[PDB]
Amino acid sequence: SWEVGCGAPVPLVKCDENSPYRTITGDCNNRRSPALGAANRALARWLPAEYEDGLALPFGWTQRKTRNGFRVPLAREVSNKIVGYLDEEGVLDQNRSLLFMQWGQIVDHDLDFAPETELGSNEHSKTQCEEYCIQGDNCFPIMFPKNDPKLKTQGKCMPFFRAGFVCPTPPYQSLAREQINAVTSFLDASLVYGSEPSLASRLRNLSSPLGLMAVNQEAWDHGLAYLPFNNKKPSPCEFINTTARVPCFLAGDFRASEQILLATAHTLLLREHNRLARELKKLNPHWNGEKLYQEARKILGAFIQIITFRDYLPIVLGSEMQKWIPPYQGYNNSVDPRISNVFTFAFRFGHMEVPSTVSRLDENYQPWGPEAELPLHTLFFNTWRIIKDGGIDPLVRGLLAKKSKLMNQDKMVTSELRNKLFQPTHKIHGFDLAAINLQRCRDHGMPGYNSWRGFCGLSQPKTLKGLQTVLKNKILAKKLMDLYKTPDNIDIWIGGNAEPMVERGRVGPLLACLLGRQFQQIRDGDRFWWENPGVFTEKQRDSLQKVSFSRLICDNTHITKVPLHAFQANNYPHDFVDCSTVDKLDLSPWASREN
Numbered sequence: 250s251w252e253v254g255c256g257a258p259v260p261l262v263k264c265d266e267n268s269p270y271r272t273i274t275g276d277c278n279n280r281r282s283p284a285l286g287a288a289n290r291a292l293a294r295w296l297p298a299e300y301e302d303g304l305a306l307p308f309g310w311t312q313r314k315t316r317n318g319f320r321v322p323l324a325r326e327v328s329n330k331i332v333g334y335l336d337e338e339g340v341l342d343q344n345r346s347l348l349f350m351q352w353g354q355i356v357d358h359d360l361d362f363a364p365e366t367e368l369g370s371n372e373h374s375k376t377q378c379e380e381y382c383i384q385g386d387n388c389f390p391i392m393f394p395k396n397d398p399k400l401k402t403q404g405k406c407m408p409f410f411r412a413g414f415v416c417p418t419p420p421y422q423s424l425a426r427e428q429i430n431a432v433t434s435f436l437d438a439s440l441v442y443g444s445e446p447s448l449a450s451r452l453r454n455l456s457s458p459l460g461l462m463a464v465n466q467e468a469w470d471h472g473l474a475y476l477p478f479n480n481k482k483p484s485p486c487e488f489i490n491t492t493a494r495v496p497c498f499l500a501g502d503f504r505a506s507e508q509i510l511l512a513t514a515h516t517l518l519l520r521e522h523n524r525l526a527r528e529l530k531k532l533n534p535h536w537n538g539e540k541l542y543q544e545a546r547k548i549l550g551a552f553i554q555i556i557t558f559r560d561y562l563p564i565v566l567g568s569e570m571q572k573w574i575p576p577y578q579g580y581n582n583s584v585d586p587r588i589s590n591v592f593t594f595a596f597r598f599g600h601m602e603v604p605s606t607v608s609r610l611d612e613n614y615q616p617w618g619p620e621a622e623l624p625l626h627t628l629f630f631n632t633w634r635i636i637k638d639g640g641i642d643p644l645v646r647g648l649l650a651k652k653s654k655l656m657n658q659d660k661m662v663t664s665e666l667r668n669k670l671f672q673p674t675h676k677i678h679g680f681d682l683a684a685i686n687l688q689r690c691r692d693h694g695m696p697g698y699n700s701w702r703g704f705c706g707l708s709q710p711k712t713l714k715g716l717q718t719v720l721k722n723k724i725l726a727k728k729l730m731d732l733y734k735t736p737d738n739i740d741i742w743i744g745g746n747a748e749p750m751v752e753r754g755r756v757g758p759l760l761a762c763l764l765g766r767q768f769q770q771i772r773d774g775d776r777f778w779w780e781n782p783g784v785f786t787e788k789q790r791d792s793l794q795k796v797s798f799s800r801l802i803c804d805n806t807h808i809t810k811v812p813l814h815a816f817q818a819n820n821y822p823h824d825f826v827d828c829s830t831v832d833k834l835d836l837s838p839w840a841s842r843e844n
C-alpha cells in the first residue's frame with residue numbers, strides 16, 4: 250500500500266539462521282522481518298506523531314499556532330511551577346535502595362537512545378544556538394519565562410537540539426518525522442557490548458583468545474579493571490576538572506560517564522563478563538576467544554534480563570505487574586519487539602527517583618573520609634572521583650545502603666537535575682532535565698496526556714474537577730490547568746509522572762500500562778529471550794535462576810556484607826548478611842565435553 254522501505258542506514262547484514270548468538274545490531278532476531286528491533290531504525294509509533302504542521306515542527310515552535318486552541322506553556326515555566334522544590338528532607342524512598350534508581354537507568358540505556366542531530370562537521374549553527382538562542386532548523390531553544398532566576402545569570406535560554414530522524418540525517422520527509430533508536434530494542438547488554446560492529450570491536454580484548462573485554466591500561470582499581478578511556482578530545486569528563494584531567498570511560502553506550510553511579514554499574518558489567526569468561530575457560534579449556542566472548546556476552550544478556558524481569562519490574566509495576574507481564578509462554582514471532590517513541594518518555598519516571606546526594610561508604614558502611622556525601626551535580630561526567638578517590642567499591646556500598654528518592658507530587662525532580670544539570674559542549678552546571686524532557690516530548694511529536702489515557706483504557710479528564718480526581722490533588726491539577734488550559738495538552742512526561750502510584754509500585758496507572766506493554770513486548774518478541782526453549786539448557790536455567798545483584802557485587806568487588814534483596818531499602822548490619830550465604834552462579838551446566 251505505502252513504502253515501508255525507507256532507510257539510509259539499511260545495514261541489511263547477512264543473517265546466519267543457524268547462529269546461536271545475537272547480532273550486535275539486533276538484525277536477524279525476527280526471521281520473517283530481520284530489521285525488527287535492530288538499532289539505527291525508527292522508534293515504533295504506537296499512535297501517530299502529533300506535530301504543529303502535521304509533519305515535523307514541534308508544538309511550541311510557532312507562537313501563533315495553538316494546540317487545541319491554547320498556547321502550549323514554556324517547558325521551563327512548567328518545570329519551575331510544578332516540578333521544582335526546595336526541601337530535600339523527607340524525600341527518600343523508605344523501601345527502595347539507590348540501586349533501584351540506578352538499575353532503571355541501566356535498563357533504559359540498553360533499550361533506547363535518540364541522539365541529538367548534527368548537520369555538517371564544524372558549523373556556527375552549533376554555538377549560534379547556545380550563543381544567540383535563535384530558533385531554527387535543529388536549534389529549538391528552551392526560552393526562560395519572565396520571572397526565571399536563570400534569566401539574571403545565564404542569558405535568555407537553554408540551548409536544545411532536535412533529535413535525529415531516520416532516512417536522511419538533514420533533509421525532511423513527505424510523511425511524518427520519525428526519531429531514531431541508536432541502540433538495540435532487545436534487553437541484550439548492548440550498553441556493555443555496543444549496538445554497532447565498529448564500537449563493538451573497538452571494545453574487545455582480541456590480543457588474548459580468552460574472550461575478555463578491553464581494559465584501562467593507564468590506570469587500575471586495587472587489582473580490578475577500569476573501563477578504557479575515550480581518549481577523544483574535547484572530553485567533558487576532563488573539562489569538569491582540568492587539573493585531574495581524567496577522560497570519560499569507553500563503554501558499549503556513549504552515555505556511560507553521564508554520572509558516577511552509571512559509570513560504576515557499567516564497570517561491574519565490564520568485570521562480571523571477565524569473571525564469567527575466565528570461569529567458562531577454566532571449565533571449557535578447548536573453547537576459542539569468540540566462543541568465550543559470544544558465550545560470555547550471552548550469559549551477561551541473560552543476567553540483565555533476569556534481574557530486570559524477576560527483581561526490578563515487579564517493584565516498579567506492583568499490583569499491575571501480573572496484568573501487563575503475565576508468566577512467560579515462549580517466543581511469539583508476531584510480537585513487535587521495537588521500543589515505542591512514548592516508552593522513551595514513560596521510562597523517564599526515573600528522573601523523579603534521583604536524590605540530591607551520592608555517598609562513599611566503608612566496610613562498616615560508615616562515611617568514607619570527610620567529603621563522603623557529595624552533591625549529585627558535582628558528579629556529572631565525573632570519572633576523576635572514581636580513579637583518584639578510591640575506585641567504585643565505596644560508591645557501590647552507597648548504591649546498597651542509601652535510598653532512592655520517592656516521587657512526590659509536591660517534590661518531583663531535585664534541583665541537582667532541574668537547575669544544575671551538566672551537558673557536553675556546554676560549560677555550565679545550569680541545565681534543567683525536566684524542561685528538556687518536556688521540550689523533547691514536543692520535539693518527538695508526542696500525543697498529549699488524554700490520547701495516552703485513551704490508549705490505556707483510562708478515563709480522560711476534560712475539566713479542572715476531572716483532573717483533580719485523576720491526580721487526587723487539587724493544587725497540582727489547578728497549576729497544570731493554569732499552564733496547559735486543557736488536560737488534552739499536558740505533555741506525556743509530566744502527565745504520566747503526576748499520577749498517584751499503583752498499590753506496591755513506583756508509577757501511576759498510565760505509566761504502568763505504557764511501561765508494562767513495552768516490557769511484555771521486548772520479552773515475548775525476543776527470539777533470544779533467556780527462557781525461550783533452545784537459547785539455554787534445562788540445567789543452565791536452573792543455574793540462571795540463581796543469579797543476583799547481591800552476588801554480582803560479592804563476586805566483582807571486595808564487599809563481603811550485602812542484602813539478599815538489594816533493591817529493597819537495606820540498613821547495615823541488621824538487613825545485611827555475609828557473601829558466603831548468597832546463592833552463587835553454578836556454571837557446571839556450561840561444562841563442555843566433546844571427546
Ligand code: HEM
Nearest residue numbers: 350353354357361362363508593596597599600603685689
Ligand atoms: C543521575 C541520574 C540521571 C541523569 C544524570 C540522567 C540524564 C538524562 C539526560 C541528560 C537525558 C537526555 C534528555 C534529552 O535530551 O531529552 C536522559 C534521558 C533519559 N533518561 Fe535519564 N538520567 C538519569 C537517570 C535516569 C533514570 C534513573 C532513568 C530510568 C529509570 C532514566 C531514564 C531516561 C530515559 C529513558 C531517557 C531517554 C533515553 C533516549 O534517548 O531514548 N534516567 N537522562
Ligand SMILES: *[C@@H]1O[C@H](CO)[C@@H](O[C@@H]2O[C@H](CO)[C@@H](O)[C@H](O)[C@H]2NC(C)=O)[C@H](O)[C@H]1NC(C)=O
Nearest residue numbers: 453454455456457459461462463464465466477
Ligand atoms: C588483554 O588481555 C591480556 C591478557 O590478560 C593483557 O595482557 C596482560 O596485561 C597486563 C598489564 O598490561 C599484565 O599484568 C598481564 O600479565 C598481561 N598478560 C599477558 C598474557 O599479556 C592485555 O593488556 C589486554 N589488552 C588490552 C588492550 O586490554
Ligand SMILES: *[C@@H]1O[C@H](CO)[C@@H](O)[C@H](O)[C@H]1NC(C)=O
Nearest residue numbers: 489490491492493494633637
Ligand atoms: C581535581 O581533582 C584533584 C585530584 O586530582 C582534587 O584534589 C581537586 O580537588 C579537584 N578539583 C575540583 C574542582 O574538582
Ligand SMILES: *[C@@H]1O[C@H](CO)[C@@H](O)[C@H](O)[C@H]1NC(C)=O
Nearest residue numbers: 578580581582583584585773
Ligand atoms: C502472538 O502475538 C499476537 C499479537 O500480540 C497475538 O494476537 C497472538 O495470538 C499471539 N500468539 C499467542 C500464542 O499468544
Ligand SMILES: *[C@@H]1O[C@H](CO)[C@@H](O)[C@H](O)[C@H]1NC(C)=O
Nearest residue numbers: 343344345564814816817818
Ligand atoms: C519492601 O519491598 C519488598 C519488595 O522488594 C516487599 O516485599 C516488602 O513488603 C517491603 N517492605 C515494607 C516494609 O514495606
Ligand SMILES: O=N[O-]
Nearest residue numbers: 354357358504507
Ligand atoms: O539516558 N540516561 O538517563
Ligand SMILES: [Ca+2]
Nearest residue numbers: 359433435439
Ligand atoms: Ca539493547
Ligand SMILES: [Zn+2]
Nearest residue numbers: 674675676677
Ligand atoms: Zn554551555
